Amino acid sequence: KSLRDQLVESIRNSIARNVFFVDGGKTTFINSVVKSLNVNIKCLPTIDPTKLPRHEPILVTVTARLNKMVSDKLKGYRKQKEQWQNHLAQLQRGLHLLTDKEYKPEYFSDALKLSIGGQDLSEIFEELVKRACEILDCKAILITFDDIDTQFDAGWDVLESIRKFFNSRKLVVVATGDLRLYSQLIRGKQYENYSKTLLEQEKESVRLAERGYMVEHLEQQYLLKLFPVQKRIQLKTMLQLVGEKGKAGKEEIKVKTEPSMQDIDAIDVRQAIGDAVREGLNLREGSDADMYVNELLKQPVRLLMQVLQDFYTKKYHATSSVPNLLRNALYGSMLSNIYRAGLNYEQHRFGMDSLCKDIFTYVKQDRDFNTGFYLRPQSESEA
Amino acid sequence: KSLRDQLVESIRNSIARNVFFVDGGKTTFINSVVKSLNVNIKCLPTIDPTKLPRHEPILVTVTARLNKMVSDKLKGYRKQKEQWQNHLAQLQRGLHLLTDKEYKPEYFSDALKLSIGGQDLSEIFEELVKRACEILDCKAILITFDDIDTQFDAGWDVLESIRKFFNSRKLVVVATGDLRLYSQLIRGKQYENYSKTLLEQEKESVRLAERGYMVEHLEQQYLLKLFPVQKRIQLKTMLQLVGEKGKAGKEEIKVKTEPSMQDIDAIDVRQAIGDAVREGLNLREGSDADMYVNELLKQPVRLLMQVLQDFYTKKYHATSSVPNLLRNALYGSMLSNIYRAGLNYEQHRFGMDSLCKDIFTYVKQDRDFNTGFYLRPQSESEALRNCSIYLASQVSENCQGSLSKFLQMLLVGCGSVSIFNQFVTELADREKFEQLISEYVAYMSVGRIESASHWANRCCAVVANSPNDEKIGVFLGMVQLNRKSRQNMPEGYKKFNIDTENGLAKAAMASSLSTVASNNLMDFCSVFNLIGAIADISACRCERSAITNAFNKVIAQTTCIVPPWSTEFSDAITKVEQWLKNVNEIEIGIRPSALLIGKVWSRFYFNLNNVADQHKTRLYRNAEHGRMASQSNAAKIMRFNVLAFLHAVLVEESLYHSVSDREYIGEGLRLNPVTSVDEFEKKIKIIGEKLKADNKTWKNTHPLFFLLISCPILHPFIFPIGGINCSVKALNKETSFNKLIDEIVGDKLLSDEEWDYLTKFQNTITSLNSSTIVGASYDKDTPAR
Amino acid sequence: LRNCSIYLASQVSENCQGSLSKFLQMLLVGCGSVSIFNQFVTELADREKFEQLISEYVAYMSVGRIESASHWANRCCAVVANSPNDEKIGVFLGMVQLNRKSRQNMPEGYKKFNIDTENGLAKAAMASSLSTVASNNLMDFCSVFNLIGAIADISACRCERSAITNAFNKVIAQTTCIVPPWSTEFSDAITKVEQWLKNVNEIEIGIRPSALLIGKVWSRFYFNLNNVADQHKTRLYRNAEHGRMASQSNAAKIMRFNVLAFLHAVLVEESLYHSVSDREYIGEGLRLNPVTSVDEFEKKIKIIGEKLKADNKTWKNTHPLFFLLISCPILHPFIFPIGGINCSVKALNKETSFNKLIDEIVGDKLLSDEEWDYLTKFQNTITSLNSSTIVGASYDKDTPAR
């Protein structure tokens, strides 16, 4: 992408917070960036916070990956090393601070032997990063964090590590995900600070209202802090990568419907969807088919991938009822949505007795009751 | 800053509680102070309570930093040292007191060996500070605490350490943050002291009330204690550092927009914001742009920094749509605010279907429902005030360069708020009120409209299930025409028939037809549906065939339900095809604001009720032919409803359209054409010959009015049969009203030989005059003399 | 709350200091936003319901987010106009609801209200008080609050003459608003407002009011207002027009005394509770309000008038706010309107001697004798409100004997 060139190239002249955020594929784009960086900038292997050991601070993972990169370099082609070890061991023995149930006085003696005073892990990690940058022939080390949609608790550890430890020039951070998720995490953590019995005592509408405005201000400032607006990345969607109604279509990509498809017969991408929709909905080429296609192009890119692939593979199947094929693909792809709405789960009673009741249920939650039986995709919500 | 000189200099002569508090950049100011101190006062490195190890008392961090400063000094240039060690070790071994789950007796023996008695950590730390002051050649050691906005639990440890340990001359404390946060912390800690089962037992309103007053007194005394009022620091805001309206501006600072900006080209700071706001909101230099800038200057200084930097860097980008740039910057900067309000998160469905629903949601939480569609930043709260400017940017970007989308904004968004107030609020508890809104959205199609005419069709039903006072079919902006020929008429009064109307007059007339299917399937001739029709043939396409079915959608009898709470057109199409091309070339040069669109609606909506009242009580048996100012019929009402639109657009667009720097309308007393065209004949005209002395046309300036006045759909309603006043006095305007219109449109509207019949037929309505209106008894005659 | 009271008193004292516009603001938006709620909105209201009624009353009233004082007064007209009873006359608290449809059979010369027959400043003063409320009938109210709101809006515009021009056009223009969700030709007048605004500008800076003064000025004003709403209510006879007497009242006399009720309220409390002078010049006397005649107003000005001289003081240094208000061209047409002047041998001795005292304060002489003579049997004087019919007014009996 030219947008990944964006991210690389602004990162390049961003060192001559320092955190770049990407909305949203996220994983594929992050990996592309990691590569395009290989004017030197080191890049740690992408960290997936949802796949790490559970109770393991992000600082531990970052330091371990940095240790492997530094030792792999140090190995080829000793004076430098034990003084990398020095900071590694001292960072270690200073790492009880993150994990302890409480403070015990034996840790005072640990804080009085000797550039600020004490055992502040921020300083030790920043010298560790200075170590790594001197050793690796690099200035800044790109700590890149992967999306957290699966389990967004780990996002809090990521945010705290970014705030407290990765705040340094020798580090540039690229995080990705959905900013609503981080909003949620931060707001919940901000509510955590209010004292218990205060919350159970002051329960007038004014108190909840002002505490809401207040957790507002705090969460907003937190996010403007860790994720500067100027450093946030697009990651457009599909409909933006293709034409709207024929008056657009920057960098069309094409999809492949058949096995042979010698990179010339590939029937577009807007087409594949239009053709599935027109065949399986029996809709003609009116503005209504382009309608359904437009809505379906706005989908999470995986959902479109899976529906469009199931349909066409089973279609090859059928040719060694298209609406049956599209219906099966849509049932599987939108399965969580229909199971939300209370529509019929079973395939063995699709028939049409359950179809009418499904439409009535959909109309009931879509309200409407006037154009709802059209089944046009106009509703409040994705589901 | 001179204010940091303040803090340093009062601290300097404050030692010759002792805690200085700073409201709120806090971090930058604190660091500046730490420096300005380097008459000696030692200063510990600034402590950030949110970045310390978790379970670590503030005393530990303070003592460690003091130990490093003392040992770094002690190193250069032994008798003193082991007696610093003595206090360090004894403070240590006396530090189990802060951390223990409980007391164990082995600690008694620790408290009996030997200036007060025991192992009180306060004394040991105060001697440690005396140690450090003797060693370092200083009197007082500035323990400076950094802001805690991130995680304000640590503020409690800070407060307790200040109260119990840093209370000493050899220590001066500078804390910073927001005093509401510390209020919260202290109040919660005070409630902590009340016994459990007491709290679960005494739960009368009096008990909670007195315990509230009581935690009041305690928290207040705590804060007056730890943070003396005389020692609290300003830390002004941005708007105070710059001018209010040009009558201020102490120590202006300037921002830099471009990379080169050789420390002279820096275009101010108030300017950068004013220029972003005026470009991305399309707001002109009126008091409204300085408005938005004033509100945005009051923001947390980081938010302004980030929005103002994103906008201008991406602007450099664009020059190797400004409203798109400002909208993106505002969306990112105010992201938490909009995500609070429940507005659309996604960028991939910004469009304008979600824009109208966003405005309705904002108005719902801003209450108002009367000026809310203005999107002015006036709300209770920071969150909705931010959302207002973000939505203004959304409107400016989405409506830019589109006459269809302008009418959309105007109708769906603003009307979706006005209609609700005056015709749906009479029903509505909060649970019930929102659900009434929920259907009003669902029925109105707000957020999911197909077409503007569809909204207007549904608007007819909503408006038509409330009015009273003799039950006439003369509603807000419409006339309910009789469709059953079962009523005994005086004179030539009879039904309405679409077949006797011809060509464009029929097409214009049929666009306004609206059928509502409650139980009687009436038919309304409504101005909204005509406006909705115009929106639907404004962005179809270059085709002539596409215009054809665009007609057939709005021309055809459109029938809808009341809410759940009560060949022959050949030349007209070329003409609409004509005017659409005319719109297409030159609609792209239109940058409206939520202010302009809201104010055009305000005039239009107001002018509408004057027509709904003045012309209501003038439906006589001979009032037809509308020859006079005090005779009205179904044709005169509709003509002035159409004229009310065009006048509203002309006036506000002469005032609030960012295509021209100034008004061509003049400083005058501004009225609406209700029963005659005095005011409309006027303003066009006074603008008409000013444009020439200014060497301007109706094209370059006043685009929207020019496109609307030139619409063939509107022309039949402008000079209908029986809607033209025929007095010697009244004609001098109306004949001179015609000329001005022709001169703008570029083609001459009615032939004299068509003009003569009017004042003594295609493209002119000839059957609405004698169409009877429901409830109009039509039994009385016009007054004489 | 006791601490909050003194804090808010300090807020009022600081913010209203040196500003006649902000003084009227405090007075109207703040204090009125409380009284109006009591007497016209409490009849509806549970605590959950009560606060929500307040929440809309704030939201509709624009309390906390007002654009202009006239906007508040326009919304105040609707709130006041959805409760009164007892024969359903259009004589409300501080206002008159004028008929706008000429469909009613009149005795005598009674007819509509028309703004076109009024001229120059009289028109401008009259049109400022026009208020339209759009519930279902779009009536028109001539309200003292909107006139006070108008004065506030042309008190802090600026030094310009053009800025005053559109300041007029905002308050002059037909202002139309909804009921709450719970029911060329002005050339010389502008120079004059431009005149009086400069007069205000030099010397408004020397005005330091208190929550006590502002609250007490409102208390007198608000009280005087209901005496006018009752004494003049039951005096609308067919021949009560020309207002020649104390027991004959019309739409012009009611409004004049509503304006006089304001000016008297300011004069009295400001003689008592304004920190610009150490003492009162009003005297230890029994203190009444001008309701049906100007006995009390002719009085206090005067007793203050010649005390100021023995004390070597002027209406400038002492009693600033009253001096600025009495000198406002906007108010003058309502002071001596046609049919609002009592024409009894007894009653005139005050009113002719009421005129002199006013001229001597303002510094310019208000009406020419040859304008004064027509009054006591025309620009800068209201001549069309006398014969303007009021809704509900019987207008059938003329001064019922005994």
Residue B171 is inside which H or E element, if any? strand B171-176
Is residue C378 within 8 Å of residue C337, measured between CB atoms? no
C165 touches chain B (CB under 8 A): yes
Q: How far is C301 from chain B (nearest CA, A)?
A: 37
Exposure string over A141-174, b if 16+ CB within 10 A, otherwise e: bbbbbbbbeeebebbbbbbbbbbbbbbbebbbbb
Residue of C nearest to B603 (CA): C176
Q: Is B542 on the interface with A (CB under 8 A)?
A: no
Reduced DSSP (H G I as helix, E B as strand, rest coil) percent helix, strand, coil of chain B, to 5: 55, 5, 40
The last residues before gaps in chain A (C-N over 2.5 Å) are 16, 24, 38, 77, 114, 320
A233 has which bridge partners? Answer: A22
Cβ–Cβ of C174/B378 closer than 8 Å?
A: no
With an 8 Å Cβ cutoff, are B191 and A183 in contact? no
Q: Which residues contact B495 (CB under 8 A, 6 or more apart)?
A: B481, B482, B483, B485, B771, B772
Token duo for residue C246: 């104390």
Cβ separation B609–C138 shorter than 8 A: yes
Pairing between β-strand A232-233 and β-strand B19-22 as defined by DSSP bridges: unpaired
Given a contact cutoff of 8 angstroms between Cβ atoms, the answer to whether C231 and C318 are in contact is: no
What's the order of all strands across the beta sheet hosting A19-22?
A42-43, A141-144, A171-176, A19-22, A232-233
Beta strands across the sheet bearing C139-143: C95-98, C139-143, C130-133, C176-177
The experimental method is cryo-EM
Helix B270-281 × helix B322-333 angle, to 10°: 110
Q: Cβ C169–B669 below 8 Å, yes or no?
A: yes
| Single-letter residue type at A230 | Q
Residue-by-residue DSSP string for B127-153: HHHHHHHHHHT-S-EEEEB---SS-TT
For residue B524, what are the β-bridge partners?
Answer: B480, B514
Q: What is the nearest CA distance from B31 to chain C, expressed in angstroms? A: 34
Tokens representing B674 are: 């209700």
**Closest by CA position to A293, among listed A312, A276, A279:** A276
Q: Which residue type, as a one-letter code, is found at position A91?
A: L
- How far apart are the C-alpha atoms of B777 and B555, rounded to whole Å? 30
What is the rounded CA–CA span in Å between residue B737 and residue B731? 9
* Contact B80/C at CB under 8 A: no
Residue B404 in tokens: 């269809």
Strand order, beta sheet including B522-526? B478-481, B522-526, B513-516, B559-560
3-class DSSP assignment, residue B343: coil
* Residue B499 to residues B507, B508, B509, B773, C130, Cα–Cα distance (Å): 11, 13, 11, 19, 46
Contact assignment for C169 to B468 by CB distance below 8 Å: no
**Tokens standing for residue B197:** 């089962």
Chain B neighbours (≥3 Cβ pairs under 8 A) are A, C
Q: After which residues is the backbone of chain B broken at C–N > 2.5 Å? A: 16, 24, 38, 77, 114, 320, 428, 566, 760
Q: Are A345 and A339 in contact (CB under 8 A)?
A: yes
The single residue listed with the structure tokens 């049929």 is B510
For residue B183, what are the CA distances in angstroms to A209, A244, B222, C72? Answer: 17, 54, 9, 36
| A interface test, pick of B54, B184, B317, B336 with most A CB neighbours within 10 Å | B336
DSSP 8-class letter at B624:
T
- Tokens 């996002």 — which residue? A155
**Distance (Å, whole) CA B686 – CA B690:** 6
Query: Which of B49, B240, B245 is closest to B161 using CA atoms?
Result: B49
Number of residues assigned to chain C? 402
Residue A229 phi/psi, 5-degree rounding, is -65, -40
Distance, in Å, from the CA atom of B584 to the CA atom of B588, rounded to the nearest integer, reads 7
3-state secondary structure of B175: strand
Closest CA of chain B from A225, distance in Å: 8
DSSP 8-state assignment for residue B766? -
For strand C95-98 and strand C139-143, is the pairing parallel, antiparallel, or unpaired? antiparallel
**Best interface-test mutation with C: which of B245, B613, B651, B654 has the largest number of C CBs within 10 A?**
B613
Separation between Cα atoms, residue A99 and residue A93, nearest integer Å: 12
**Residue C51 to residue A117: CA distance in whole angstroms:** 55
Record the tokens describing residue A178, joined without a space: 């959905």
Residue A162 contacts residue A17 (beta carbons within 8 Å): yes
Which residue from C352, C358, C301, C360 is spatially nearest to C332, judged by alpha carbons? Answer: C358
Could you write out the three-class secondary structure of chain C? CHHHHHHHHHHHHHHCCCCHHHHHHHHHHHHHHHHHHHHHHCCCCCHHHHHHHHHHHHHHHCCCCCCCHHHHHHHHHHHHCCCCCCCCCCECCCEEEECCCCCCCCCCCCECCCCCCCCHHHHHHHHHCEEEECCCCCEEEEEHHHHHHHHHHCCCCCCCCHHHHHHHHHHHCCCEECCCCCCCCCHHHHHHHHHHHHHHHHHHHHCCCCHHHHHHHHHHHHHHHHHHHHHCHHHCCCCCCCCCCCCCCCHHHHHHHHHHHHHHHHHHHHHHHCCCCCCCCCCCCCCCCCCCCCHHHHHHHHHHHHHHHHCCCCCCCCCHHHHHHHCCCCCHHHHCCCCCCCCCHHHHHHHHHHHHHHHHHHCCCCCCHHHHHHHCCCCCCCCCCCCECECCCCCCCCCCCC
**DSSP assignments along B225-293, one per residue:** HHS-GGGEE----HHHHS-SSSS--TT------SS---SS---TTHHHHHHHHHHHHT-TTSHHHHHHH
* Assigned token pair, B737: 């009203």
First to last CA, chain B: 79
SS (H, E, C) chain A: CHHHHHHHHHHHCCCCCCEEEECCCHHHHHHHHHHHCCCCCEECCCECCCCCCCCCCHHHHHHHHHHHHHHHHHHCCCCCCHHHHHHHHHHHHCCHHHHCCCCCHHHCHHHCCCCCCCCCHHHHHHHHHHHHHHHHCCCCEEEEECCCCCCCCHHHHHHHHHHHCCCCCCEEEEEECCHHHHHHHHHHHHHHHCCHHHHHHCCCHHHHHHHHHHHHHHHHHHHHHHCCHHHEECCCCHHHHCCCCCCCCCCCCCCCCCCCCCCCCCCCCHHHHHHHHHHHHCCCCCHHHHHHHHHHHCCCHHHHHHHHHHHHHHHHHHCCCHHHHHHHHHHHHCHHHHHHHCCCCCCCCCCCHHHHHHHHHHHHHCCCCCCHHHCCCCCCCCC
| Separation CA A375–CA A99 (nearest Å) | 54
Give C279 to chain B, closest Cα distance, Å.
Answer: 35
DSSP code at position B629: T
d(CA C142, CA C99): 10
| CA–CA dist B469, B467 (Å, integer) | 7
A152's tokens = 């967004």
| Residue B605 to residue B644: CA distance in whole angstroms | 8
A248 touches chain B (CB under 8 A): no
Residues B510 and B530: their CA atoms lie apart, in Å, by: 9
Close Cβ partners of B34 (under 8 Å, ≥ 6 residues apart)? B43, B45, B46, B142, B144
Q: Which residues contact C8 (CB under 8 A, 6 or more apart)?
A: C211
B387-390 long-range contacts (CB < 8 A, ≥24 apart) are B387/B334, B387/B337, B387/B338, B387/B341, B387/B343, B387/B362, B388/B362, B389/B277, B389/B281, B389/B292, B389/B295, B389/B296, B389/B330, B389/B334, B390/B327, B390/B330, B390/B331, B390/B334, B390/B337, B390/B338
Which among B64, B192, B211 is the nearest to A118, CB-wise?
B64
Q: How far apart are CA B364 and CA B145, in angstroms?
A: 42
- Going by C-alpha positions, the residue among A146, A316, A307 that lies closest to residue A238 is A307
- List chain C residues with CB under 8 Å of B430: 52
Q: For the CA atoms of chain B, what is the radius of gyration? A: 37
> Which tokens is B636 given?
């005169």
Phi, psi of A43 (to 5 degrees): -135, 120
Q: Which two tokens stand for residue C153?
A: 């809006």
In angstroms, the CA B384 to CA B365 distance is: 8
Resolution (A): 2.5
Rounded Cα distance, A380 and A368, in Å: 11
**Residues C307, C326: contact at Cβ < 8 Å?**
no
Q: Could you tell me the CA-to-CA distances from B108 to A108, B100, B112 in Å, in that order?
A: 22, 14, 7
Round to whole Å and give the CA distance between B198 and B217.
20
Q: How far off is chain A from B757, nearest CA to CA, in Å?
A: 45
Residue A372 neighbours by CB under 8 Å, 6+ apart:
A359, A362, A363, A366
Residues 6+ apart with CB under 8 A from B484: none
Q: Please say whether the beta carbons of B406 and B652 come within 8 A.
A: no
Whether the CB-CB separation of B348 and B296 falls below 8 Å is answered with no
> Taking CA B346 as the corner, what is the angle to CA B340 and CA B350, rounded to the nearest 5 degrees?
105
Give the residue from chain C lying closest to B475, CA to CA: C136
Q: Is C166 on the interface with B (CB under 8 A)?
A: yes
Q: Is residue A125 within 8 Å of B75, Cβ to Cβ?
A: no
